Write a protein that holds these residues in place. Sequence first.
Motif, PDB file in Angstrom:
ATOM      1  N   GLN A   1      44.962 -74.265  92.888  1.00  0.00           N
ATOM      2  CA  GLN A   1      44.563 -74.554  94.254  1.00  0.00           C
ATOM      3  C   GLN A   1      43.261 -73.877  94.566  1.00  0.00           C
ATOM      4  N   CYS A   2      43.104 -72.622  94.215  1.00  0.00           N
ATOM      5  CA  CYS A   2      41.866 -71.922  94.561  1.00  0.00           C
ATOM      6  C   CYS A   2      40.635 -72.635  94.032  1.00  0.00           C
TER       7      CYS A   2
ATOM      8  N   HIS B   1      39.898 -75.774  93.840  1.00  0.00           N
ATOM      9  CA  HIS B   1      39.375 -77.050  94.361  1.00  0.00           C
ATOM     10  C   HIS B   1      39.872 -77.399  95.790  1.00  0.00           C
ATOM     11  N   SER B   2      40.793 -76.632  96.426  1.00  0.00           N
ATOM     12  CA  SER B   2      41.231 -76.877  97.776  1.00  0.00           C
ATOM     13  C   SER B   2      40.539 -75.903  98.757  1.00  0.00           C
ATOM     14  N   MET B   3      39.677 -76.439  99.642  1.00  0.00           N
ATOM     15  CA  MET B   3      39.090 -75.557 100.619  1.00  0.00           C
ATOM     16  C   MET B   3      40.099 -74.951 101.586  1.00  0.00           C
ATOM     17  N   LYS B   4      41.184 -75.645 101.893  1.00  0.00           N
ATOM     18  CA  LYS B   4      42.195 -75.023 102.762  1.00  0.00           C
ATOM     19  C   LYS B   4      42.812 -73.824 102.096  1.00  0.00           C
ATOM     20  N   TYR B   5      43.104 -73.881 100.796  1.00  0.00           N
ATOM     21  CA  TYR B   5      43.529 -72.637 100.107  1.00  0.00           C
ATOM     22  C   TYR B   5      42.449 -71.588 100.079  1.00  0.00           C
ATOM     23  N   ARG B   6      41.212 -71.991  99.778  1.00  0.00           N
ATOM     24  CA  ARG B   6      40.154 -70.968  99.643  1.00  0.00           C
ATOM     25  C   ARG B   6      39.910 -70.269 100.997  1.00  0.00           C
ATOM     26  N   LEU B   7      39.958 -71.013 102.082  1.00  0.00           N
ATOM     27  CA  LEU B   7      39.450 -70.534 103.350  1.00  0.00           C
ATOM     28  C   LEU B   7      40.498 -70.268 104.422  1.00  0.00           C
ATOM     29  N   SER B   8      41.704 -70.781 104.278  1.00  0.00           N
ATOM     30  CA  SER B   8      42.767 -70.545 105.272  1.00  0.00           C
ATOM     31  C   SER B   8      43.903 -69.737 104.696  1.00  0.00           C
TER      32      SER B   8
END
Length: 35
Positions: free
Chosen positions: A16-17, A19-26
């Motif tokens: 997830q880290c 390629h998912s911005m929601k994982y990276r940033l939320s």
Amino acid sequence: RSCIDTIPKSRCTAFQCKHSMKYRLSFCRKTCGTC
Ligand SMILES: [Li+]
Ligand SMILES: [Li+]
Ligand SMILES: [Li+]
């Protein structure tokens, strides 16, 4: 310390880290290295 993950870090998967911005940033800012 302000830098935390908002979900259990067992689910802050590398998968997830990458390629998912929601994982990276939320949900996983600490485990993904945003903070
Ligand atoms: Li674990
Ligand atoms: Li998840
Ligand atoms: Li699971």
